[PDB]
A paper describes a structure:
Before the glycosidases can act, the terminal glucosamine of HS must be acetylated by the integral lysosomal membrane enzyme heparan-α-glucosaminide N-acetyltransferase ([name]). [name] catalyzes a unique transmembrane acetylation reaction where the acetyl group of cytosolic acetyl-CoA is transported across the lysosomal membrane and attached to HS in one reaction.
Acetyl-CoA binds in a linear fashion that traverses the entire TMD, while MU-βGlcN binds at the luminal mouth of the acetyl-CoA binding site with the amine group facing the acetyl group on acetyl-CoA. The CoA moiety interacts with [name] through an extensive network of polar and hydrophobic interactions: a large number of polar interactions at the cytosolic mouth stabilize the 3’-phosphoadenosine, while R345 and R275 form hydrogen/ionic bonds with the diphosphate; the pantothenate group is accommodated through hydrophobic interactions, while the cysteamine forms a hydrogen bond with M282. The carbonyl of the acetyl group is stabilized by N286, whose mutation is identified in MPS patients. The GlcN moiety’s interaction with the luminal cavity formed by the ECLs is mediated mostly by polar interactions, including with the proposed catalytic residue H29711,17. R372 and E499, whose mutations lead to low activity and mis-localization of [name] in MPS patients, bind to the 6’-OH and 3’-OH of GlcN respectively. In addition, N286 is positioned 2.7 Å away from the carbonyl oxygen of the acetyl group, which stabilizes the negative charge in the intermediate state. We observed slightly different configurations of the active site between the two monomers where one monomer appears to have bonding distances better suited for catalysis than the other, suggesting that the two monomers may be in active state asynchronously.
Residue numbers in the entry:
A (entry chain A): 76 to 170, 176 to 228, 265 to 663
B (entry chain B): 75 to 170, 177 to 228, 265 to 399, 407 to 663
The structure:
Amino acid sequence: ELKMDQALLLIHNELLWTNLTVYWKSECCYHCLFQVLVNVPQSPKAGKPSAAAASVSTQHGSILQLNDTLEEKEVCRLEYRFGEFGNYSLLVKNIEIACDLAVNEDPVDSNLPVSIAFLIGLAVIIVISFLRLLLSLDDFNNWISKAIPPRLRSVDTFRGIALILMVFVNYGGGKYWYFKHASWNGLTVADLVFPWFVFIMGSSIFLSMTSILQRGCSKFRLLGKIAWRSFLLICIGIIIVNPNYCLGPLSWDKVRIPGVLQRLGVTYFVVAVLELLFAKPVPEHCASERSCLSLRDITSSWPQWLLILVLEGLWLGLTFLLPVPGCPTGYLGPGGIGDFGKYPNCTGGAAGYIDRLLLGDDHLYQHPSSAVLYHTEVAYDPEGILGTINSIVMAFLGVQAGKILLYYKARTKDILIRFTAWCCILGLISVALTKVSENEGFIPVNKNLWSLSYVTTLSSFAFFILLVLYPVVDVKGLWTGTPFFYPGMNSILVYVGHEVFENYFPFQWKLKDNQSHKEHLTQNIVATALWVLIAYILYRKKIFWKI
Amino acid sequence: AELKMDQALLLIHNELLWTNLTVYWKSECCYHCLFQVLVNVPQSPKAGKPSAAAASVSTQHGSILQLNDTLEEKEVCRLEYRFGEFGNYSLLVKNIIACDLAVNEDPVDSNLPVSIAFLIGLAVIIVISFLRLLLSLDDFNNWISKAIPPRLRSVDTFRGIALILMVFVNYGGGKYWYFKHASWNGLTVADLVFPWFVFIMGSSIFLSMTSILQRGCSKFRLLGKIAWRSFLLICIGIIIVNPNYCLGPLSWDKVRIPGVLQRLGVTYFVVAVLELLFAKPVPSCLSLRDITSSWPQWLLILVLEGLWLGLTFLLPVPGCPTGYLGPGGIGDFGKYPNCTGGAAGYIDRLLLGDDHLYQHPSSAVLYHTEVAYDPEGILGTINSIVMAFLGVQAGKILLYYKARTKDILIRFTAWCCILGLISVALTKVSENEGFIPVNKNLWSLSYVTTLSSFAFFILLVLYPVVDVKGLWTGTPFFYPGMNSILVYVGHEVFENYFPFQWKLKDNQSHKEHLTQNIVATALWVLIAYILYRKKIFWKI
Ligand SMILES: CC(=O)SCCNC(=O)CCNC(=O)[C@H](O)C(C)(C)COP(=O)(O)OP(=O)(O)OC[C@H]1O[C@@H](n2cnc3c(N)ncnc32)[C@H](O)[C@@H]1OP(=O)(O)O
Ligand SMILES: CC(=O)SCCNC(=O)CCNC(=O)[C@H](O)C(C)(C)COP(=O)(O)OP(=O)(O)OC[C@H]1O[C@@H](n2cnc3c(N)ncnc32)[C@H](O)[C@@H]1OP(=O)(O)O
Ligand SMILES: *[C@@H]1O[C@H](CO)[C@@H](O[C@@H]2O[C@H](CO)[C@@H](O)[C@H](O)[C@H]2NC(C)=O)[C@H](O)[C@H]1NC(C)=O
Ligand SMILES: Cc1cc(=O)oc2cc(O[C@@H]3O[C@H](CO)[C@@H](O)[C@H](O)[C@H]3N)ccc12
Ligand SMILES: Cc1cc(=O)oc2cc(O[C@@H]3O[C@H](CO)[C@@H](O)[C@H](O)[C@H]3N)ccc12
Ligand SMILES: *[C@@H]1O[C@H](CO)[C@@H](O)[C@H](O)[C@H]1NC(C)=O
Ligand SMILES: *[C@@H]1O[C@H](CO)[C@@H](O)[C@H](O)[C@H]1NC(C)=O
Ligand SMILES: *[C@@H]1O[C@H](CO)[C@@H](O)[C@H](O)[C@H]1NC(C)=O
Ligand SMILES: *[C@@H]1O[C@H](CO)[C@@H](O)[C@H](O)[C@H]1NC(C)=O
């Protein structure tokens, strides 16, 4: 009867001279038009009020505006938050007319009941099952006999955490609203992994390129390697990751040109080529002081910083200045019914227009993140053309983190000072941009547009994560990234694998109740743990696929 | 138009007045098919103007049209014809009871013109495209530079040929009827692949066991390797290869336990454990010592063959004749609607259930069988083991007389002749008649002997040319031969992916399907070649 995060609302109209219409709009909508929930009729006779059944969304909040089809006057505005499976009864009576809320069945309290208790129980059960399976393997072997520079590992732990979170939220994340990507604006747990992947990509770009150059290899061989790696990423993404082959053979008239791997390849090429051309040897003798307050890692890359600033200015100018036909200039909203629905075919503004012009409507993402909340009827691709500038900026921030990590290697206090300084600077910039509020600010945090505040917020998060991880996993040694670094070293293999093997049995099976959050959560956690186990097994076999 | 692929539009005109003629159709190749109703032709309203009926006769190979009156059923005209693709044939039955077969539009061959000269044309096209891609890609790099224990390779070539055939016929094989699996009895191009894979599997089993036992190891880590490889093959077959995950998530109640890789794993375990349990070291014009040293496993193979024969021809099956080999459905005059496989089908449905079996057997499209019958069932694994052991015998022949090439060809010719004689004795040189007709779905003993004789002849041809005389390394073939498992898993996983599958301008065209499948097979050969160059052979 009811679906996930969907309370059942019954409207009892005790009125006898009005045809009430209940409207609806979530709290998380910024400026959304009210959608008709159900059209309750008037009571034919006194004593027996007219009733109708409506299913209200539970994910986050609910605004119910009561209007009558005759005069269109707000008899009462009710603003509540519903539960996952709740028999809610709304009665409105003339006393003038006030609508009161009654609960006939208590909600399941989605994400309230599971909390950390169910997660700990599931983890214990999975660990016990794995240990029992491992012990059973030795039982068969016994019965048969009876019968007859190195890797940082902190960047690796960072990438492993990002990969685990990405595998969890890509498989559904328990079908929870906050483990999915945000509709248009703000941040969720699924909006963090991709920026961290670009950050780590830039960091590893600098680490690998400087290792290769100081190992005595020509810059042209590295240029060829970079070009081949970016081309392979783009082709792999376009041919394998982007299209859903369960719907039929791939036709060029509906091929999704831009994607996650295409974005990664393009920004890899751009920022890696920037580093290659403007490559200076890593200074070593300069690290002779104690906690040196030198800006060497920044002033040694003034041309790349100038190019990055020019690119960021280009992104800001195109976003806020490019005149989109039939659209306000500098439009950042979601379109659809968002922003009071006055721009329905304007999902993404300048970035969406650039994508639709250069690549066409059919070569974009047909199911954007905003399509489920703001009801966008057009196609917008989060990995568009305009957002690649901000992805390049993020990759260069990762490059800066790598320069911090390598220029000062012996002085771990210097590394921590630089990480804290950069995290604070980027956090202050993000707070200034987004104005702390989710939907307010000059450039609100947005994954779909890859907003500048999105880049800065996620880069500050990445700098803080590196600040926490580098001493613990490298200097102090209190933790080896025990379950995380195997995905860190098999990132590309795990990404291609889980984007290819989404529907295979160990990662996805038929569920007893498809509308249960706990069943989906168990399936997604088991699938993520199995991908970690696969990465660990390949680590033991020393099978590291690299492009 | 409304005509499909491999179908012909048959217009029927009845000049008869007091007739309610119905047209019954039955494909020529079916052994004993009930005449299904094709179309119902109504009585002509008046003289001069006959009633017209539109039908699509399956022109894959032949068609039998029988016309008997609807009321007081009596045949008025029995017509046998071999229709052509996209043919507009008009049937004119007129009162004189006479028949006419006027061809209103000439048929399109779509088989000779596409697979006779268009095959060579497409080969030239793909060769030119590959050469241009190789030259242009290196030209750009050159512009920048200017500006600034041994493997035999015969078994490898055999396995590569089998892999090329499997990739071609698994993708559709041009959607031709002879590049698919024959509906129950008979041998097609697609039926030749799996038995050769089992044969090569057994040959490689012996060729690896001999090397390992001669080197430093024991028959206790070899047993672990064999058991783990069998378990891995079975698990891969159950999880990855078998289910069609595009439909939805896997479920226990509707998961297909049998499979190609499950069958390969079970037969590998059985035959490899047999050789390990009876492992002897290698030591001749007519020595025959290879068949005598391996006498216990030959005795066990004969016992297993007797068991398969006894279960097939003697196991009682409820609601089914004892010793049934027929396809069921409308086959055998439809007297056994649900008897697909007989003993093998009943054993599968009794041990694994009817939901853990192949729901689209090759007999469904022609004999109209509604039950689920799995070609890789439980009964046929005995014959899979027998053919794997014939491959093991080929390996023993090849390894025992390594320095006596003439001995190798003498033994290969002798074994091929013996197995061919056994096959022609069992099938009486007829696909549907005989004692044990050739059948992939039952994995018949005559199927095993025929395909093993074919494999022995293929080895007899390949071994001198590719090993002894050295005239031709298996240049377009052994590259998949060295990556078989990866190639199989890859084309099972990446069936729908762009290089191997793209949307066609008209899905009802044999030329477009053939070119797409040839391009896909060539791309898989190219992938295997690239992996060979980089030495990324995946094993176990
Ligand atoms: C939002 C959602 O829900 S979807 C989330 C989106 N998901 C994704 O984008 C996942 C896909 N991306 C990825 O898997 C990765 O980011 C990749 C593969 C594209 C790039 O990973 P990278 O950071 O380039 O690392 P990778 O493992 O490929 O190695 C690249 C180079 O960096 C080097 N490197 C990596 N880590 C380190 C380290 N810690 N120290 C030193 N060198 C390192 C490697 O040695 C290699 O150089 P080499 O070949 O010369 O030896
Ligand atoms: C009919 C249709 O359309 S669908 C049916 C078609 N599909 C199938 O049959 C499934 C696909 N099958 C296959 O890919 C293969 O048959 C496999 C992988 C299952 C088995 O291949 P095999 O012949 O066993 O060889 P594989 O490469 O796996 O290695 C087996 C062993 O034989 C050895 N070997 C292989 N070829 C040779 C050779 N020519 N000489 C000596 N030893 C050899 C290998 O070295 C290996 O031993 P090792 O572990 O010491 O290295
Ligand atoms: C529900 O009723 C209220 C009040 O009747 C509507 O509020 C006004 O509606 C008129 C249109 O009749 C608009 O011109 C006004 O701008 C609205 N606001 C105010 C403050 O007057 C409300 O629009 C109705 N709901 C919907 C979905 O239209
Ligand atoms: C749920 C899901 C199923 C699937 O079959 O695979 C996915 C792949 C995903 O990845 C995202 O997909 C969109 C465009 O690719 C963008 O929202 C993001 O940028 C990108 N990280 C996200 C979700 C899924
Ligand atoms: C169509 C298809 C696509 C693919 O990519 O994979 C296949 C693999 C096939 O092989 C057959 O599959 C069945 C066993 O699973 C049995 O009909 C036969 O024994 C076996 N020859 C046949 C068809 C396909
Ligand atoms: C309410 O709508 C019904 C039809 O659905 C109509 O018969 C009735 O007159 C309406 N009442 C008012 C007060 O408009
Ligand atoms: C909800 O409650 C009402 C009365 O309180 C009852 O009639 C109805 O059956 C209930 N529905 C569900 C789904 O529990
Ligand atoms: C058509 O009629 C003839 C009349 O004897 C009969 O023998 C034949 O079986 C009929 N065809 C059917 C029933 O398919
Ligand atoms: C077959 O020929 C008839 C001639 O009477 C014609 O009307 C019909 O359209 C033809 N079929 C097709 C598919 O064109």
